[PDB]
Each structure stands twice: as structure tokens, then as C-alpha cells.
Amino acid sequence: QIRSLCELYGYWSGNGYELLNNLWGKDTATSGWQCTYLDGTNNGGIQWSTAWEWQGAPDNVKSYPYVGKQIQRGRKISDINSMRTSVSWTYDRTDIRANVAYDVFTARDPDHPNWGGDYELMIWLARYGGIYPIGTFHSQVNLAGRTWDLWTGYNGNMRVYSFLPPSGDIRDFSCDIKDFFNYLERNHGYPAREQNLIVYQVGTECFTGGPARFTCRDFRADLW
Numbered sequence: 001q002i003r004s005l006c007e008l009y010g011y012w013s014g015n016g017y018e019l020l021n022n023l024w025g026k027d028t029a030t031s032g033w034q035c036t037y038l039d040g041t042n043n044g045g046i047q048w049s050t051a052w053e054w055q056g057a058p059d060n061v062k063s064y065p066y067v068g069k070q071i072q073r074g075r076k077i078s079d080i081n082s083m084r085t086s087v088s089w090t091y092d093r094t095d096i097r098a099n100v101a102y103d104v105f106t107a108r109d110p111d112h113p114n115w116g117g118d119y120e121l122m123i124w125l126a127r128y129g130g131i132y133p134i135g136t137f138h139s140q141v142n143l144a145g146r147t148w149d150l151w152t153g154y155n156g157n158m159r160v161y162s163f164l165p166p167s168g169d170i171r172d173f174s175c176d177i178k179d180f181f182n183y184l185e186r187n188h189g190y191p192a193r194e195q196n197l198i199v200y201q202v203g204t205e206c207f208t209g210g211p212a213r214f215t216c217r218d219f220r221a222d223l224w
């Protein structure tokens with residue numbers, strides 16, 4: 001690896017991307033740790049991985065290490081035409097409580113900190129070990145060439161929309177996240193004209209299990 005980010009909130013940035021050893025829930029663990037590795041920045045993308053083992057509090061996320069596309073504050077979702085992104089990944093085992101997911105926060109306050117927002121949009125590409133997203137099942141949705149189970153609920157005051165695969169995982173994926181926002185704007189009254197983009201990330205939420213290793217073979221993200 002080019003860089004090993006094994007410290008709590010170990011951080012790298014470059015080429016308009018960033019990487020964080022985001023162990024935000026680790027104090028709920030009874031044992032374990034996690035490191036995030038920058039493997040490459042080849043071909044306009046990021047190659048990275050994270051290794052971990054966690055015990056304790058099986059409904060509590062211990063971490064969400066991520067790669068993020070850096071964005072400028074004050075961009076209304078309605079004024080973003082496209083958020084094209086692709087990811088290729090593997091997990092070395094699936095007998096773990098973990099997901100792989102895109103995470104996007106938006107807020108009416110354009111200076112909202114990056115830990116949250118008014119709304120969260122997640123696109124889950126894996127759902128291992130019997131975990132649940134925030135909230136309850138809402139409906140099925142056709143987007144990005146697939147069928148999704150949409151779940152909705154609240155994390156504090158933040159409304160969370162999570163799009164889940166009905167079956168299996170999706171280890172090679174590409175989409176335009178604006179298709180997901182546009183669907184929410186039309187059918188869920190999502191206030192895109194007053195919401196600013198806060199973060200644009202992909203990573204893995206880790207609850208319990210391991211030793212496990214997530215490899216992101218390639219990540220690319222743009223927005224226009």
C-alpha cells in the first residue's frame with residue numbers, strides 16, 4: 001500500500017478524492033480495530049482496502065471507512081445534473097455483519113458538518129450477517145438497471161433513504177446518483193431545490209465479525 005491509515009480518523013486526500021479510517025462507533029466495540037489502506041490512485045480513480053475485526057454491540061456500526069469525492073459547498077441538488085460513479089470491490093468473507101454502501105448527505109445549511117445532514121441517501125451493494133438499514137421497507141424502485149428495496153426512516157432528525165439489493169450483492173456497480181435523487185424528488189417530496197450536497201462517498205459499514213478484508217479494486221466519481 002502507498003499509505004496505511006491505521007490511526008483513528010487517519011486521513012489522506014489527493015486528486016480531488018479523500019480517504020478516512022472512519023471508526024466513528026468504535027467505542028461501542030468490546031474488542032478489535034481496523035486499518036484503511038490507500039493501494040493506488042491509478043487511471044482517474046482510487047484503489048483502496050480496509051481490514052478489520054470487531055466484537056460487541058451487534059446493532060451498532062463501529063466504522064464506515066470511505067473514499068469520498070471532494071465537493072464544493074453550496075451546490076443545490078437540483079443544480080447538479082449528474083453524479084456518475086463506479087465501484088468494483090470484493091470482501092474476502094461474508095460471515096460478518098457489514099455492508100458496502102454509497103453514502104450521501106445533504107443539508108439546507110451549506111456549511112453543515114460532514115458527519116451528517118438533513119437527509120441521507122444510501123445505496124447498499126451488500127448486506128451481510130442479517131443487518132438492517134435505518135427504518136422500514138417502503139417500496140420497490142427501478143433505477144440504474146436494477147430493482148431496489150427502498151427503506152426509509154430517521155436517524156435523529158435526519159431522514160434516511162436506503163436503497164438495498166433484494167438478493168445477493170453487487171460487486172461491480174455503476175450509476176448516476178442523480179437518478180436516485182430525481183426519484184426521491186418526484187415521489188417522496190425530497191426538497192432538492194433547498195438541499196446542498198455535503199458528502200459523496202462509498203465505503204463499508206462494519207458492525208461485527210472478522211478478521212475481514214474489503215478491497216476496492218477501483219472507485220471513480222464525478223459530478224457535473
Ligand SMILES: OC[C@H]1O[C@@H](O[C@H]2[C@H](O)[C@@H](O)[C@H](O[C@H]3[C@H](O)[C@@H](O)[C@H](O[C@H]4[C@H](O)[C@@H](O)[C@H](O)O[C@@H]4CO)O[C@@H]3CO)O[C@@H]2CO)[C@H](O)[C@@H](O)[C@@H]1O
Nearest residue numbers: 024059061063064103114115120131132133134155160205
Ligand atoms: O453518527 C455519527 C457518524 O455518522 C456516520 O454516518 C452514518 C449515518 O449517521 C447513519 O445514518 C448510517 O448508519 C446506519 C446504518 O446504515 C444502519 O444499518 C444502522 O441500522 C441499525 C439501527 O440503527 C438499529 O436501530 C437497528 O436495530 O439495527 C440496525 C442494524 O441492523 O444504523 C446506522 C446508524 O446508527 O450511515 C452512516 C455511515 O456509518 C458518519 O460517517 C460519521 O462521520 C459520523 O460521526
